[PDB]
Every structure is written in C-alpha cells, then in structure tokens.
Design an enzyme around this catalytic site. Structure first.
Site, short mmCIF file in Angstrom:
data_model
loop_
_atom_site.label_atom_id
_atom_site.label_comp_id
_atom_site.label_asym_id
_atom_site.label_seq_id
_atom_site.Cartn_x
_atom_site.Cartn_y
_atom_site.Cartn_z
N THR A 177 -11.74 -45.39 -28.99
CA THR A 177 -12.17 -46.13 -30.17
C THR A 177 -13.36 -47.05 -29.93
OG1 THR A 177 -10.74 -48.03 -29.92
CG2 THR A 177 -9.81 -46.09 -31.09
N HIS A 181 -5.63 -53.37 -22.90
CA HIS A 181 -6.42 -54.33 -23.64
C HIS A 181 -5.87 -54.37 -25.07
CE1 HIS A 181 -8.19 -50.44 -24.46
NE2 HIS A 181 -8.36 -50.93 -25.67
N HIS A 198 -3.42 -51.46 -26.46
CA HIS A 198 -3.68 -50.14 -25.93
C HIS A 198 -3.44 -50.10 -24.43
CE1 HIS A 198 -6.50 -49.24 -29.54
NE2 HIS A 198 -5.22 -49.08 -29.82
N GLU A 201 -6.34 -51.32 -35.16
CA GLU A 201 -7.21 -50.17 -35.32
C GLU A 201 -6.50 -49.09 -36.14
OE1 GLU A 201 -9.00 -49.38 -31.35
OE2 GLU A 201 -10.64 -50.48 -32.34
N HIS A 255 -16.32 -56.85 -24.98
CA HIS A 255 -15.73 -56.29 -26.20
C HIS A 255 -14.24 -56.53 -26.33
CE1 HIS A 255 -15.22 -52.36 -23.88
NE2 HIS A 255 -16.41 -52.72 -23.43
N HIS A 272 -7.03 -55.20 -29.41
CA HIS A 272 -7.98 -55.41 -30.49
C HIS A 272 -7.31 -56.37 -31.47
CE1 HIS A 272 -10.23 -51.77 -29.17
NE2 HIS A 272 -9.02 -51.40 -28.80
N1 LIG Z 1 -9.76 -48.44 -27.33
S1 LIG Z 1 -9.22 -47.17 -26.55
O1 LIG Z 1 -9.26 -46.00 -27.42
O2 LIG Z 1 -7.98 -47.44 -25.92
C1 LIG Z 1 -10.35 -46.76 -25.32
N2 LIG Z 1 -11.63 -46.71 -25.47
C2 LIG Z 1 -12.30 -46.22 -24.41
C3 LIG Z 1 -13.66 -46.06 -24.19
C4 LIG Z 1 -14.15 -45.53 -23.03
C5 LIG Z 1 -13.27 -45.12 -22.03
C6 LIG Z 1 -11.91 -45.25 -22.20
C7 LIG Z 1 -11.38 -45.77 -23.34
S2 LIG Z 1 -9.75 -46.06 -23.83
ZN LIG Z 2 -8.46 -49.96 -27.47
#
Ligand SMILES: NS(=O)(=O)c1nc2ccccc2s1
Ligand SMILES: [Zn+2]
Ligand SMILES: NS(=O)(=O)c1nc2ccccc2s1
Length: 257
Positions: free
Chosen positions: A195, A91, A116, A103, A61, A93
């Site tokens: 997210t 990571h 993020h 996002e 992803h 997006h």
């Molecule tokens: N994309 S994020 O909000 O930074 C993010 N998503 C997730 C999903 C599962 C566990 C930790 C995180 S941190």
């Molecule tokens: Zn993220």
C-alpha cells in the site's frame, strides 16, 4: 518524493509508480455481505513465540518495528497460504482523528488505525526476491478502534518520543507482537499489493475481522510523530493511509460463517 501531503499524496503516486492503477491494488473495501465463506481455507497459524524484535525506525511514512528474520522464528502459515512466511516488520497507518486512519474499510467503515504485520515467503530466499513474486508477501492486517487501552501496545507508544523524526531509530528488543492480536483469528483474504510505493503486487492479504481496542491516549501519541526530518518544518505524521482501490477482478473470501 511521494508522501501523504497535499501535493505528493496517493492521488499522485501513479505518475512515478504506474502500477498504482493496476489490477490487484490494495487496500480495498471489504463488503461483508459479498465476501463468501470458503470452507477450504484453513485456520491461520500465527507462530510468534520465538519472535526477536531488534529496532524501531521512523522511516518518514510510518514507524517500523523490525525483527530478526535471518532464520525461521516468527512465522505465519496456514490460512490461504502455501509454505512459510517470516515476520520482517510491523507498522501502522492512522488518522488525524479517530474517524479515519485504516487502509482497508469494512462496509465503507474506516477504523482509527490499521496494523500491518509483514511476512515474506521463505521459498524465495530473501525479502528482496520475495517482493518480486505474486505470492511473495503475506500481510496480516488488524484494525484498531479507540476504547480501552491495549496493554501490549504501551511499550511501542512509550518509545515514540525517541524517534520523532524521519531517520531516527532506537533499540527495541524483546517486544512480543502477540500482545497486539485480538482474541479471534477469523479473517478475510484476497490477493493484492503493498500500500506504499512501489505498490508491488506481491501480497496475500489476511485481514482480521475483530479489531483491537487502543486508548485515545495511545493513538494520540502516534499523532505526535513527524513525517519530516530533524530541524525541518514540523509536519505531523497523521493520515498516512492510502484510500480503498478498485476491487476489479477479485473475490474476498471469509474464513468464518
Ligand atoms: N503497507 S503494506 O502493504 O504493509 C507494505 N507496503 C510495502 C511497500 C514496500 C515493501 C513492502 C511493503 S509491505
Ligand atoms: Zn502498511
Ligand atoms: N507521488 S509521486 O508521483 O511519487 C511524487 N509527487 C511529487 C511532488 C513533488 C515533487 C516530487 C514528487 S514525486
């Protein structure tokens, strides 16, 4: 399983993750005129001098740059936060073209991408326990726009050819995440969620106002990654962003006038 394709994207997630329609979902649109300056917020403390990156992974992803979080080294404190949050991974997006990818949005503007930096609250002892708590994570979000190259990003882009497909990883030591920050630490903050599934409502969001600039060539290399595994039909890893969700009963606070 869930993804960002035509048949398993964000509009489908609620069927397996009903919290997708919850009361504090992320991301959200940041209405800059409505966000109120909060003089009680403190300056952020981003302490990454002792960060130890270890590995970069294509998880199907996004790609995660993973850190050694076995003790306090790279931590986030201050701002809206109580206590100490350890950096575990970062990571991005991003979009199929420069006009989408972020996002969070700012007055409905979509940036080309969003970084993020994910941190967990050490008062819960381990990351897996932290994500079960309403104040378990702090995610530092940074917008990317396309312009001049970001020199500190180039080491990331250059390793992407080696992790093209889901499940591939590579050693990625000695990477300094300070090279991904903008000049200013002015920010917006609000309570939200992860997210991606399982969309847990465990995140204090800290979204920096100042975007970083990356070059077109840099983001083009993100867009050569694959969602699929090795030998499977090629699906370019693009548009791996969740759209803005309802703000509901939340206030977005600004650290700045
Ligand atoms: N994309 S994020 O909000 O930074 C993010 N998503 C997730 C999903 C599962 C566990 C930790 C995180 S941190
Ligand atoms: Zn993220
Ligand atoms: N987005 S999701 O509810 O998690 C999901 N969507 C799909 C579509 C086809 C097959 C399995 C799943 S699981």
């Amino acid at each position: 399983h869930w993804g960002y394709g035509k048949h398993n994207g964000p509009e489908h997630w609620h069927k397996d993750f009903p919290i997708a329609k919850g009361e504090r979902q992320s991301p959200v649109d940041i209405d800059t005129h409505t966000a109120k300056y909060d003089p009680s917020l403190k300056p952020l403390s981003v302490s990454y001098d002792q960060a130890t990156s270890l590995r970069i992974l294509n998880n199907g992803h996004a790609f995660n740059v993973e850190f050694d979080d076995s003790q306090d080294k790279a931590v986030l404190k201050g701002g809206p936060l109580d206590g100490t949050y350890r950096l575990i991974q970062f990571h991005f997006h991003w979009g199929s073209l420069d006009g989408q990818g972020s996002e969070h949005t700012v007055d409905k503007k979509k940036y080309a991408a969003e970084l993020h930096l994910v941190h967990w609250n050490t008062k819960y002892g381990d990351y897996g326990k932290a994500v079960q708590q309403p104040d378990g994570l702090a995610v530092l979000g940074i917008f990317l726009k396309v312009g001049s190259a970001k020199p500190g990003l180039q080491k990331v882009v250059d390793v992407l050819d080696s992790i093209k497909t889901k499940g591939k990883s590579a050693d990625f030591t000695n990477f300094d995440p300070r090279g991904l920050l903008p000049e200013s630490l002015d920010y917006w903050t609000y309570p939200g969620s992860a997210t991606t599934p399982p969309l847990l409502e465990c995140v204090t969001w800290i979204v920096l106002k100042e975007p970083i600039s990356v070059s077109s060539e840099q983001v083009l290399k993100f867009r050569k990654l694959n969602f699929n595994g090795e030998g499977e039909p090629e699906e370019l890893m693009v548009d791996n962003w969740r759209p803005a969700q309802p703000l509901k009963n939340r206030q977005i606070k600004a650290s700045f006038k």
